[PDB]
A paper describes a structure:
[name] ([name])—the eukaryotic sliding clamp—is an 86-kDa homotrimeric ring with a six-fold pseudosymmetric rotation axis running through the centre of the clamp and a central channel lined with lysine and arginine-rich α-helices through which DNA is threaded (1–6). The front face of the [name] ring contains the site of interaction of polymerases and other proteins, named the PIP-box binding site. The [name]–associated factor [name] (hereafter named p15) is an oncogenic, 11 kDa intrinsically disordered protein that regulates DNA replication and lesion bypass via a PIP-box interaction with [name]. p15 co-localizes with [name] in the nucleus of proliferating cells mainly in the S phase of the cell cycle. Thus, p15 outcompetes DNA for a common binding site in the clamp channel, and the stoichiometry of binding dictates the available sliding surfaces.
In the electron density map, however, no significant density was observed that may arise from DNA, suggesting that, although incorporated in the crystal, the DNA is not sufficiently ordered to generate a structured signal. The electron density map showed three p15 fragments spanning residues 50–72 in the corresponding PIP-box sites, with a conformation analogous to that observed in the co-structure with the p1550–77 peptide. Notably, due to steric hindrance, the location of the p1541–72 peptides would interfere with DNA binding to [name] in the orientation observed in the [name]–dsDNA binary structure, suggesting that p15 may outcompete DNA for binding to the [name] inner rim. Accordingly, when [name] is co-crystallized with three p15 peptides and DNA, the electron density map does not show features of DNA in the clamp channel. Critically, p15 shields key residues at the [name] sliding surfaces, confining DNA in discrete positions, which depend on the p15 stoichiometry of binding. This mode of binding, with DNA partially competing with p15 for a single binding site on the clamp inner ring, is also supported by (i) our NMR study showing that DNA does not disengage p15 from the inner wall of [name] saturated with p15 and (ii) our structure of [name] co-crystallized with three p15 peptides and DNA, showing that DNA does not occupy the central channel.
Numbering used by the authors:
A (entry chain B), B (entry chain C), C (entry chain A): 1 to 255
D (entry chain D): 51 to 71
E (entry chain F): 50 to 72
F (entry chain E): 51 to 72
The structure:
Amino acid sequence: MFEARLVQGSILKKVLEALKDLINEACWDISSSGVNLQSMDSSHVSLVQLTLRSEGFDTYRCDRNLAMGVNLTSMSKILKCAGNEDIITLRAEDNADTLALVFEAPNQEKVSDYEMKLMDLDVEQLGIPEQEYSCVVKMPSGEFARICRDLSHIGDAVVISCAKDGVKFSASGELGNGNIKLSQTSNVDKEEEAVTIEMNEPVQLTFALRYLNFFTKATPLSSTVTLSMSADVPLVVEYKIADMGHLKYYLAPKI
Amino acid sequence: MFEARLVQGSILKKVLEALKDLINEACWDISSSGVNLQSMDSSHVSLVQLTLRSEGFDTYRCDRNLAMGVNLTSMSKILKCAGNEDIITLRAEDNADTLALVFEAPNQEKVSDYEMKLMDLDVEQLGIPEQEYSCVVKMPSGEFARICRDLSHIGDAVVISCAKDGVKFSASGELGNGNIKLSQTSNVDKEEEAVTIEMNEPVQLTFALRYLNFFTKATPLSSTVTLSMSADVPLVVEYKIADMGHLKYYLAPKI
Amino acid sequence: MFEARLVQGSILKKVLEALKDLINEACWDISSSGVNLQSMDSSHVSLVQLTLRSEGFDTYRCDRNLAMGVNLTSMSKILKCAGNEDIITLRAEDNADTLALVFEAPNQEKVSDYEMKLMDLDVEQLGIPEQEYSCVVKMPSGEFARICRDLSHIGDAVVISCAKDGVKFSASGELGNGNIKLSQTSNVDKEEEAVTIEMNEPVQLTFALRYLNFFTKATPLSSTVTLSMSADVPLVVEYKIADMGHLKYYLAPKI
Amino acid sequence: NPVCVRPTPKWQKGIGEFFRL
Amino acid sequence: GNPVCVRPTPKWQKGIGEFFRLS
Amino acid sequence: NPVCVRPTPKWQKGIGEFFRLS
């Protein structure tokens, strides 16, 4: 048996919407350290890693390690039922094929219980090498979504060119060109507003905008995002989950 | 002539939003006491009855009883041009197979007015007996609207259970199961928010979510809704209109 | 060399939104006087004419008259890469196969420059009779757009009747009949709210609401709008881009 | 969440089976 | 909540060609 | 200006080619 109570249930919902687009079937690793997802996309292209560490929950109890097989669309559908302020609790049997979700209103007036089926699935893991990035860009999530969305219109791929005094995003297609130039500024007062480039070298990389656009669906988890880059090495797009954990996205660049 | 002049135009709009996707053509029975509509829906499953008492208009003049066959879709279309604050007059001429609608703004410098073709229609009228019902739930309209909507992802019918504790909305499908527990809220004044169960006995009936979901289009007419039930007797889903009347839908349970 | 810096960049997005739908493509003719554009819709019915005088730009340099062949969608697509808040510079060199736009924010932290590929257009001018008109109505832009919206529900065409006290929009078709009566207003406050008519002779004229609805896409360019008609003479719907120019659409009435 | 419009169940009985003209 | 019913062109509609001449 | 769904470029390599299964 397993039981996880989460006061900001919103967080589960946001996660799924981000996820469902990428892959329909994923295997959820429950261990006493927390909740963990790792899966390639249905195209076998990008790689998504979700960590919801146990101390982020008001109540986490896990006896045995479990692997629930979840179809993400169903879990999304069930999730939508949850109110925004609702508190979501996940509960599951051990060695048993079912998942239970409880949704408690803030008024404390009403309570909903859904029993979603699990499914048979085996998923290959990849071993993520932890390693060192020539450039690491920290910027607003919103702004990143917009930039991709807009270069989306220009061309297939975005070139991200990292340099000490800012980052540049660019594309080419039938309409024409576009270069968006974001200056490094450490100045600002709220620090989600910032652009920041912990650079050890300059880097210029070409990425598929089909996939960055899928990743920016995690945008409403975090007001900030981080792109870690290196030449011939999978980009890591990372959205911090409010001190509970991360959503991280992996994507190989050109050549 | 029949001339009827309602300050709160929106009522009229709201009312036609409610029935338009339910009834293609309806007979509007005007008399001096007021306006009543009764019709089955297209598929002859549910039944709708409207009552706007004359008391409830700023002006109501009825020369004689009237039976106006109106293509609701087209009546809806005209009311849509109507502004929300708009003062709406419905005017009818004794000879006429013509319904005139007149919208005047609070602006007081624009005046719209339309005419629509009435048709000859056959009125068959089901008698609905006065009654006492085993349970009668008073909940807020929106909550109900949400409940039916969410469950409609779960399966094709809902189950409604009452005791004096509260009322449990449940469903199940290929996906899984849902139970939504509203616990009673009568003690608080809760004029809008409250849930009240005037149960005379317990009830446990099964309704087609498809039809409840048409009914919930009346939601904007009233902050609350009431469900009156008893076994093998059809459900009365009632939306008050403010001192003017009500919009009741009738819908049959399983077995 | 052409270079124009427009503080209110929004003006340039708004114009495009208004036109993309009516005009696939068009020559933007530039002179020291300014930017002026005229063209017929893909179906050769109506005539749109745009005029941005140099006076109205915070920087303007034309050296040489150039006529730029532009795909209005493609240009719309690119302008949507610019913030409302953004300042917009247009650059273009002589005999360009390309026009370049630049977008600078409130902070100048983000700077965007795009290059839109031009095209060749075999389009020759149409001479615009200067006229005095039988009636000239001026009224909220929204109120116009609302009327042509509402009455599009009623029928293919609108009938504008002009009188000294007020002006009157009517339609009809399968649904029925409707009339919207706008009386002229004493005011003075507010000018935006105002209606005012200039009757030399009265008019009664009929036009397609297909096209009027297309024209009212210019609505966010000005809080008021300006109708100019005379019998058997092509209508002029006019939106004034403040302190610069205007966008005028010209439309053929019935017989 | 928006209404996923369901089919009319097969058990469904018309209102004219409980109400008389 | 009113959208724009976008309408057909009357058969009677004459093009701006027939009211203005080429420059 | 909404997302335009671009296709996957003929050059895209799978993340398979950069990490070890399993």
